[PDB]
Amino acid sequence: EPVKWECPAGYEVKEGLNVDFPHKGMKRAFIVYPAKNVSGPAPVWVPMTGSVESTNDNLTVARSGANSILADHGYTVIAPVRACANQDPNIRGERCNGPGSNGWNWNPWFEGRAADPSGEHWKNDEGPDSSFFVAMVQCVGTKYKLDARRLFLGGICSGGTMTNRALLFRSNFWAGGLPISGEWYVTSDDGTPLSFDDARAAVAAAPTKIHQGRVGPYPLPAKVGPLIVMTVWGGEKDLWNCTRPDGSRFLCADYRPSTQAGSNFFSAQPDVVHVACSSTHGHMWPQLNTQEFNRWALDTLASHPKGSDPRSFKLTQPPEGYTCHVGPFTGLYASAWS
């Protein structure tokens, strides 16, 4: 499935904020920072915020990743605004941080089917964000020279869940991605949705198995296109507490099983290099040596352009504060042989 450069008719792409981009009946927005110090096609980074941080926060605030700085690193950054933010890159959690509607699990991104029957249709339809991102990058590529073998997306929290969904449904487009503390929404093998507690126990009970999940197609694809996927877990405190209508908080997500599950699926894929990375910063954009991490992670992904031989990949040491290796996570659950 070749990358085609094309824009909705008459759409004029610009550096900076782009609004009213038409896609599937919606009007979308995204921000473009062209790569610096690059001649020729540039690798692409599509960073996605989570539930509460704004797209501007994800792009410019250090503690949120300051993702626009990757343009100073030689990547053309194309950052989508969440549909729930109504094209405003400054919206944080307002009308975004909460349960989804129309069969979607969570409102920040169309990143997983809901647990009730209204989500049935999303079992095999990527949804409007996954397709928007493809249209977005194909359009930007008509104005800026983009490297079709190095289109990467990634994000934190719900943006990490969205990265997982996009990789599973558009593995013949993206070259890879960086799902940081994203959900997998583990289900039974028959697709039955599981509660947070039952999903957490299913992985603890079979930590090396491939688990189905609401984040992706049901069943998950037998084979995906060539990719490099770097999954990041934030350690013991990488957990998320939801907020009830009354303001009370309760545990609703644990990223240990979801990063494990994703790593098991991607590691098993023959044309996928999976890098499992662990840190101790919790559930937020990597905090230790943040920019060093961003540079190391994107350059690692770029070292495996789409269609490269997994056997040729050579991992380099990550920044202090991170431990990474090729394959599934191993330090999250006890090994069987133990």
- Decide: 246 and 192 in contact? Cβ < 8 Å: no
What SS3 string covers the chain?
CCCCCCCCCCCCCCCEEEEEEEECCEEEEEEEECCCCCCCCEEEEEEECCCCCCHHHHHHCHHHCCHHHHHHHCCEEEEECCHHHCCCCCCCCCCCCCECCCCECECCCCCCECCCHHHHHHHCCCCHHHHHHHHHHHHHCCCCCEEEEEEEEEEECHHHHHHHHHHHHCCCCCCEEEEECCCCCEECCCCCECCHHHHHHHHHHCCCCCCCECCCCCCCCCCCCCEEEEEEECCCCCEEEEECCCCCEEEEEEHHHHHHHHHHHHHHCCCEEEEEEECCCCCCCCCCCHHHHHHHHHHHHHCCCCCCCHHHCCCCCCCCCCEEEECCCCCCCCCCCC
Q: Which domain holds residue 243?
A: 1-338
Could you give the CA distance from residue 338 to residue 330 in angstroms, rounded to a whole number? Answer: 12
Q: Which two tokens stand for residue 194?
A: 């599981």
CB-CB contact of 181 with 233 (8 Å): yes
Q: How far apart are CA 65 and CA 87, in angstroms?
A: 21
* Strand pairing category for 249-254 and 239-243: antiparallel
Backbone phi, then psi, for 132, in 5-degree steps? Answer: -60, -45
Burial (CB count within 10 angstroms: exposed 0-12, middle 13-18, buried 19+), residue 32: buried
Total tally of structural domains belonging to the chain? 1
Within 10 Å of residue 237's Cβ, how many Cβ atoms?
11
Q: Are strands 42-48 and 227-233 parallel, antiparallel or unpaired?
A: unpaired
For residue 94, what are the contacts with CB-CB under 8 A and spacing of at least 6?
none
The amino acid sitting at 222 is: A
Q: Rounded to whole angstroms, what are the CA distances from 165 to 34, 200, 206, 321? A: 26, 19, 22, 27
Nearest to residue 155, comparing CAs of 47, 290, 256? Answer: 47
Q: Whole-angstrom Cα distance, residue 297 to residue 267? A: 17
Distance of CA 172 to the CA centre of its chain: 16
Cα–Cα distance between 195 and 225 in angstroms, integer? Answer: 31
CA–CA distance, 65 with 42 (Å, rounded to integer): 21
- Number of Cβ within a 10 Å radius of residue 138: 18
Experimentally, how was this structure solved? X-ray
Resolution (A): 1.6
Residues composing the chain: 338
Amino acid present at 246: D
Cβ proximity of 220 and 202 under 8 Å: no
Cβ atoms of 236 and 283 within 8 Å: the answer is: no
312-330: string of b/e by CB count within 10 Å (b at 16+)? eeeeeebbebbebeeebbe
CA angle 198, 128, 172 (to 5 degrees): 85
Which residues are CB-neighbours of 52 under 8 A, at least 6 positions away?
92, 93, 96, 97
Report the alpha-carbon distance of residue 173 to residue 40 in Å, rounded.
20
Dihedral (Cα; 39, 33, 259, 288), 10-degree rounding: 90
Q: Which residues touch 46 (CB under 8 Å, ≥6 apart)?
A: 77, 78, 79, 80, 133, 136, 137, 151, 152, 153, 154
Q: What is the CATH number of the domain that holds 103?
A: 3.40.50.1820
